[PDB]
Amino acid sequence: TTPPSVYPLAPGSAVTLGCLVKGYFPEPVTVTWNSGVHTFPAVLQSDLYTLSSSVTVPSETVTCNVAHPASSTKVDKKIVP
């Protein structure tokens, strides 16, 4: 078993946001945004799952909430400019 690393997806200083969930095992993983959007199916490589989820909407705040039941792990990564 392995908890996932969650990475924020913010635009490259140059609105859609997202989160990247890398290296977790096993499935599944639940993804919500500030608990109330596109969560793509996972891909399996090297025995680890990776997934991503976007959201269309800095003044107001957005935070993706990713949960991994298997390892009783949670992660809530705010997206910063």
């Binding site: 924020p8 859609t16 997202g18 793509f40």
Partner: protein
């Protein structure tokens, strides 16, 4: 008309030594990745519900300046 969005690696990931570039996109669609203009095929993993993800080592990411997500429109970002 898909609304494409491209994203650079986060500092958090880079700190761990990896570099993933994410791109959010009739079903038929084709995504092409470019690094400094030339096509890159290895290290790409796709998902459809579309999302394309180019993973590289930090060293490799640091070797180039431009990353481009090209659909079937072109969206990109320069590290510098």
């Amino acid at each position: 008309a898909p609304t494409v969005s491209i994203f650079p690696p986060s500092s958090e990931q880079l700190t761990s030594g990896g570099a993933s570039v994410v791109c959010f996109l009739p079903k038929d669609i084709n995504v092409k990745w470019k690094i400094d203009g030339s096509e890159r095929q290895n290290g790409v993993l796709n998902s459809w519900t579309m999302s394309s993800t180019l993973t590289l080592t930090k060293d490799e990411y640091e070797r180039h300046n431009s990353y481009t997500c090209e659909a079937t429109i072109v969206k990109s970002f320069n590290r510098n």
